[PDB]
Amino acid sequence: FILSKIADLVRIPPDQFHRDTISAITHQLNNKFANKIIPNVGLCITIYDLLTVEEGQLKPGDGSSYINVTFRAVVFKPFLGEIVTGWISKCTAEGIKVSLLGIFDDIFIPQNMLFEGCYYTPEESAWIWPMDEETKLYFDVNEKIRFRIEREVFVDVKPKSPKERELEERAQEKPPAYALLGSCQTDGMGLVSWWE
Amino acid sequence: MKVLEERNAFLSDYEVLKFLTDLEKKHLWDQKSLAALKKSRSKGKQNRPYNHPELQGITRNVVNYLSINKNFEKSGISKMSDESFAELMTKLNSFKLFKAEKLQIVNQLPANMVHLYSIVEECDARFDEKTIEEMLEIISGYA
Amino acid sequence: KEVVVSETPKRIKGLEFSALSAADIVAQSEVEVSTRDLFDLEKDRAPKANGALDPKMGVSSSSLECATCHGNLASCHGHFGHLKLALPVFHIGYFKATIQILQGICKNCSAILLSETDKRQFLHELRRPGVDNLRRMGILKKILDQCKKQRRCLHCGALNGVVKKAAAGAGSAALKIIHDTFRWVGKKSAPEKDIWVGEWKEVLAHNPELERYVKRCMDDLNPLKTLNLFKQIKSADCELLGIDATVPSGRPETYIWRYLPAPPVCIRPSVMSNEDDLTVKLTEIVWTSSLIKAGLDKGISINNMMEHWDYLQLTVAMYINSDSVNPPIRGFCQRLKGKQGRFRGNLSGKRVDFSGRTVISPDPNLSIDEVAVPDRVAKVLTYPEKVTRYNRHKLQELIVNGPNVHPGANYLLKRNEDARRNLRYGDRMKLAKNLQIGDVVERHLEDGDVVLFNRQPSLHRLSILSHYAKIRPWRTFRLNECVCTPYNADFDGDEMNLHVPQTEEARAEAINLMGVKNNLLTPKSGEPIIAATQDFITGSYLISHKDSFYDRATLTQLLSMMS
Amino acid sequence: NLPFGLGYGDVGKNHITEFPSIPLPINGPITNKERSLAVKYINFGKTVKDGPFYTGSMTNDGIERYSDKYLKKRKIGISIDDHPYNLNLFPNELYNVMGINKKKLLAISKFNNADDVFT
Amino acid sequence: TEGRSRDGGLRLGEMERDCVIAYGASQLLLERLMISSDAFEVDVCDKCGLMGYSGWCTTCKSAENIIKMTIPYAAKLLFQELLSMNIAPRLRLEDIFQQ
Amino acid sequence: EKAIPKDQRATTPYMTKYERARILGTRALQISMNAPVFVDLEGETDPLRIAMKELAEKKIPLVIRRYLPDGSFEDWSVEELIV
Amino acid sequence: YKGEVLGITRFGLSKMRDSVLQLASFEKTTDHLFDAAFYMKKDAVEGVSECIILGQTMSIGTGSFKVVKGTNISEKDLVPKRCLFESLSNEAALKAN
Amino acid sequence: LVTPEDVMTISSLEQRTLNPDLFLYKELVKAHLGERAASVIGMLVALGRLSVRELVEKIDGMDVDSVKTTLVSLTQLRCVKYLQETAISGKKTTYYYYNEEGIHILLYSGLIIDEIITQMRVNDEEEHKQLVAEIVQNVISLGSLTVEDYLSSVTSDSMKYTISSLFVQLCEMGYLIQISKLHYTPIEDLWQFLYEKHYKNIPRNSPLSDLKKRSQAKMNAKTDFAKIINKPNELSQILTVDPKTSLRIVKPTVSLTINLDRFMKGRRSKQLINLAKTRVGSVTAQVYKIALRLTEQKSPKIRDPLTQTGLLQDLEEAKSFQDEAELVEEKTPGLTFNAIDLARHLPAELDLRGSLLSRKPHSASLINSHLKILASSNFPFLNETKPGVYYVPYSKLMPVLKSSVYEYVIASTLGPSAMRLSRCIRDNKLVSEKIINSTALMKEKDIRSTLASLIRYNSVEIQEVPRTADRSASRAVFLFRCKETHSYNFMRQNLEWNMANLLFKKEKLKQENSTLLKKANRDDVKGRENELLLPSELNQLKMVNERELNVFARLSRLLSLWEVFQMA
RNA sequence: GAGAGGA
DNA sequence: CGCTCTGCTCCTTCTCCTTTCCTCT
DNA sequence: CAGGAGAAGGAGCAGAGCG
Ligand SMILES: [Mg+2]
Ligand SMILES: [Zn+2]
Ligand SMILES: [Zn+2]
Ligand SMILES: [Zn+2]
């Protein structure tokens, strides 16, 4: 978790003029930055602080209060010096997707920088990895698994056409927008209890 | 909307937990608070809590993730105090870590030789003589 | 998931006029109109695949689809098409600009006709820190005169004369450009003149009957040669001609018709089918362009090809503007210019909603800053009042009343819903019970509401004033006669307009700036203009005449009469 | 008025090609001598892209890390100023941006006559 | 519409808008001549000031610079008629707020 | 460009009729959007009358940015302006 | 005020007001619009006619200024707040490792 | 049917609007220098003569340091031609132009290196051809070099001596010249400066007459103008003989660059040889080639004496230029030659024994006879000064060369009937359709078809003779002329745009597939393509390289086709 | 579309 | 010393405007 | 169908320089 520093413009409707101004500012910022991915920086958790608030301005047709504000948001962005635990939701023969307990389930780690003995198994989908004469070291679903993050992918493109939107709706894309690629080159991964 | 700084000063994974818990207390999102007034009885005072669904969900998920059982039934940071954090920073400043991996081992306190060796690059090559077991014995107690 | 979305309020900083460079015309387009026919003639008059009324260019009906935004007539902004011409033609709007560009350049090297020092000085004058339109136009005209003074190209070393309209006639002659190379060579030896003499000697040896026409017959600049010359004008010599070459489309060749932007069908709807003038004109343009293109490959007579080219040029000129030729199409120029054009009939002065117009009658008992309104029109002139926890009870009572009894309401718009819920039917009692704190009630006009009372012609500012509405049974806008001096009202059968502002801002500005009480003095001299009219001065004079002597009862009756 | 050399069959739709159909004869297969030039056209150009006079442009975290330490610098970037300059040619106002007082260093653009094209 | 057989409004022409200008009433002018007469929510591209449909520029084909704003439908009709000629009314936008 | 400090502000300390009408319109628009009022309501419902009553007691919480032609601007509080 | 006596005809106005839309609205619409397209004029919409045509707010009258609501927030809470982060950040670069 | 959403993408219509000069120059600078340099060159071409302040204002990348770095990058590579003018009213300002010769040098790099290697008889020895190729590559890529830096780069004494000898030989040959501030001053402004200091200095007494005063000023200015133009071409720096060992060595401190005029004269010689190869035998073509190589250094400049660009041509005295040129074209000592010199320098591999048949080696008589048959043709390949003495007339050979190239381009693109019609209209003058049919002997239907397809370019011009008060059709007549200047200019612009389009496509393809191109040099893995990359990457890289090779081959062909129109 | 009140 | 361009200045012949709209028919 | 006011080409002379 890392503090950011973002400057934005906040619309305060007259309904919220009675409460504290900072409370309304934080409410609107949360309405914009609660559990959403800020492009090129990751996912924002909660508006932490608030500093350098300029006097609000009114446009000639709405009657709200538009305030230019700066604040320090809470975002998650681990690059290299980290080890992250997670759970397992679904696995198939193209890698393993590691999930958390509600934060976000977008981390997918393939078997590129993983253990050499890992292999696929359509049945009892698992990550069998002998590494010795004993081959009973398969990865189980819904268990602690530690992994490193080697790189982060940002999907920040949208060249879609209205005709294409209508065609896809009649026929109904890369849903992820902030995913991290995992690595388990060193030991101690797979389960925090396997390595003592 | 322009991001003035893509990354400000780093935040330790102890201030975030207490900050979120205090935020839920102010907004009355505590499990005890919701079980007391909003559960097992009707709102006599009708003092409704904060009404942000997405914020409630994300803050509950992050506080639960920070308060899971420690990955070797609590995460240590749950019972960690500010003075315990001061003791921990003194102990870590007495040691040598190039990056701010000190905050990284604050994030997770595995208290294992293998995990501490893996968390920092070339732990054996950098220094592995007598202070590594001291690190493990002071990190076994989360305080 | 759910990446953030950020929006900011933005206003129109300012327009930047320019032309389209035959690459933005194609970029905007959805279909190339390449068929003279309009309807398929088989599937019950459906629009053709690439005709003028192609659906991809918009929808002219209320029960069709535009195939590009998939909306009805109300929700279709309209989409453009492109029509690629053959043998480009002059743009009638830029024809004088084309003349100036031709006068500013050679006809062999296609380079500007000013010396290096002269163009440096002129550019220095153009790039002064403060220059308006007038000084810039004067500088450009001086540049044009200076380059018209030139007799030889500085690079090609070719003779240059005068570039002028052919005959300034009605049709083709008004769009023909002739170059007179040999006007300024009086008696000096010019190699071009000798070449001309040799060429005409050759042709007269072959055909001697054209001797009488060797006079005149100047260098003719058809649109194709003009385009080929404009393609060679260096950008560094383009600022002196007035064209800013910094951005694309800032080229002299973008002012010659090579692609016609076919406007959306919304701009040129079909009435009851019966297509309007623009569709017919562009259909004719497509037909003539196809004829020219086919004749190019069929090897038609050069006379026929030139005649069809000229006919196409006249057709597109009429399309842009119907004043070009006499032999009543509503050209875009007709649609814009005029008293009823878009600028003077639709942009600077529109027809506004929530307005009425009725006869006027006097009403002395009505105080100034008030106007009496019929309840037959106070029940249609609704004001949108938003529930605000101060008038929730009043608004729900009005909803209960309904749209028939005057202190009621016509429409209810819920906070989240889009369509207005009419209060004419649907058990409005429960709707009043379910009146939230953000809904809008179109309440009937009532006492104390602000209205704009106006009488035409609006000679001065006091011809329109803001009054407080009152409700009276009759059918006439009744106003106190004292305020009839500003409007110049007559009560001889005069009529007046009454507008109802629909926002708190407009209403407050009307009642505080245009209020009758705040406009008792005319602005031209400051002398009062709202005061006693006829018969009020007579009553005052009869009361204050020295013969008047009142006892106590008569005095008290008078004092109860004035109050 | 349909012309003498045209009929109603050939007219009715205005189909302009919008695509060229008249090619120059310079599109034929390349020759060995022409294949050489190219290389001396790809090599030149490549050298000036690697050359100091480019200024073409119109991860990197501030956190110290032992991993980035003990790693060599990518190369010895040669800026525009470091190149030797004949001062009497350039305008005076550009002297403040060149290497008027800087260590001399010139890069030699070696030419490899062997083609770098695959196969 | 204009007549009385067609339920139409009263024309507030050039003289009336000049009278409104004389009072210096700006919000009332905006409400009368745009809000209560004809309001259209158009999508103008922030790069090339040409109106787009459904948040689609149709020229940049990016939908990133599209900005929604309300202008009179008469102005939109004028812009389309000018674009039908060889005139490009490229609207340049600036932030209303931010000082 | 910057705001002229309150200590010296050439603009008239009076309140022009245009500023008064705009303040009343803005306050009435805010009140019509369910905004709190700072005066004794006395049963009035139309937002314009509430705005007028608030301006009578100088209770309207708005300020005016008087934009000079150069670009600078003096911020005048409605309470400080005189009528 | 431009320097020379200028009438109130369509000729004297064309030498006073640069705004192409205003001149087109007054008189000689198509000629002015085509001239502004050719010379590539860059008018900034500030006149009342320009604002009315584009549905904006004028610069005269009530649109000659701005209305601003004071946030009225104290300086004793807007200051940055944190719980002793600089403790563990004792500048590890001070020591060798 | 192709929708416009696809036409805008795969029809090259967006770039079809760009001016060919601006398009070509910006594309070349972007490919060889970068994006900032491309933007600066684009502003220079679009506006012309911009100072640093105006360049900063007119570009979004308005960093003053960035603009100055771009300007020094363009000046060291002489892609710009600045000018330092002093304002009398106050502060002086320096204005920058766009240098066409430097951008052409960037354009002709491959051809320049090919000419350098081939013309010097050093490829045969196979040992210093690499050295001279590296020398010319460094000179053309770094802009301006002093010999001491190049020599100090190398260490071997033998290599140093070889490089110095090659420098001396190249400078003597004429491909390398001393670079001076004259190379960074516009010729038009140079003539403007030289017009004064010869007109102002005239005493305020009655000058002969104002027209005669200006004539005297022009006559005095042309002399020192030609002198200062030829000053870099005097070899005043190579003559540092005997510093030690008494050998001819170039002065170390003198900066040397490549002489574009010499290379373009070589290109003109090659074009003339190619033209002659279509009129005489292979042996006679070889004789003409060796004569051109002998007279190449002493030939007049390809473009002009540099006075045509400087000022207005004249009232009508522009012909004087021609005459003056013709005088030098006949009287430069190196130009005139006899068969003896050719026989002296003719290679022994040429048979030259049975080539010529008397009636239905290295013999002087046979070479003289071949020169006579060269001079006999209507094409002025050679002209006779004295009995048995020949000189190649460049003045009378440019128009015929341009006409032949243009006619053959028309013949290749359109049908041969197009060439027939163009030549018929050119030889005739103002010819109607009936006379066209009479003197061309083909179908009038195809005559009209070809005329319509040909008028699309500035090849055939329609002259309208009105037979009524109104000049409308169906009554007027339409004659046809040629106006070869329009045709030449339009075809030159067309070829420039085609070259710019090829370069734009090449850069686009390089950028699109840049990942594997970068990987090819990420770890110095060049030459190991098959043994390190995936087969799909192998195929993709092979296709990219072949496409770039074809692009540059077509660019070389376009250059060989447009040089003739570039001549004057 | 154009004939005419009307104020 | 007439001769021959420029340049200026008339002179003629051309183009764009003429409230408000407010109805009916 | 009248009235007003500009822009654009012929056309007739001064004026300058000249070989
Ligand atoms: Mg009356
Ligand atoms: Zn549509
Ligand atoms: Zn010319
Ligand atoms: Zn766009």
Author numbering:
A (entry chain G): 2 to 173, 189 to 212
B (entry chain D): 1 to 72, 91 to 161
C (entry chain A): 2 to 273, 280 to 334, 349 to 584
D (entry chain Q): 18 to 75, 101 to 161
E (entry chain B): 1051 to 1149
F (entry chain F): 71 to 153
G (entry chain A): 1364 to 1460
H (entry chain O): 25 to 384, 447 to 654
Extract from the study:
The yeast Ty1 retrotransposon integrates upstream of genes transcribed by RNA polymerase III (Pol III). We report cryo-EM structures of Pol III in complex with IN1, revealing a 16-residue segment at the IN1 C-terminus that contacts Pol III subunits AC40 and AC19, an interaction that we validate by in vivo mutational analysis.
In the absence of IN1, this crevice harbors a molecule of detergent CHAPSO that we used to optimize cryo-EM grids for samples containing nucleic acids, as reported. In reported yeast Pol III structures, which all lack IN1, the C-terminal Zn-ribbon (C11-Ct) is either disordered or occupies a peripheral location next to subunit Rpb5.
